[PDB]
Design a protein around this ligand. Sequence first.
Ligand SMILES: OC[C@H]1O[C@H](O[C@H]2[C@H](O)[C@@H](O)[C@@H](O)O[C@@H]2CO)[C@H](O)[C@@H](O)[C@@H]1O
Length: 93
Amino acid sequence: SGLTIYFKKPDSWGTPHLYYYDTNPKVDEPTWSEAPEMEHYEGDWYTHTIEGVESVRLLFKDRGTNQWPGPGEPGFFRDQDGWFDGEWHVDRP
Ligand SMILES: OC[C@H]1O[C@H](O[C@H]2[C@H](O)[C@@H](O)[C@@H](O)O[C@@H]2CO)[C@H](O)[C@@H](O)[C@@H]1O
């Protein structure tokens, strides 16, 4: 299985990282500061695949203090791929 997630980077952000927890099925889960670099995709879009996973809660961050959603707010729940530009889409919008 595995979730591919694409994320449109806000202009003022550094390169996005994907933080995730509540993996199902359970898979290794990085620390906030060790959340992985999303690979550059096309233009503003970046991407990362969580291996081994049907569902996840996730937050986007950079190496700075930016994150979406806010500090402490629950991760976005996916399900399925994958495109977030401020709202979620099954296809590139
Ligand atoms: O790990 C569960 C926890 O993850 C998310 O928390 C982040 C938080 O949003 C960051 O600002 C920073 O404090 O690191 C935390 C993870 O260690 C969710 O926001 C939170 O709801 C969830 O419980």
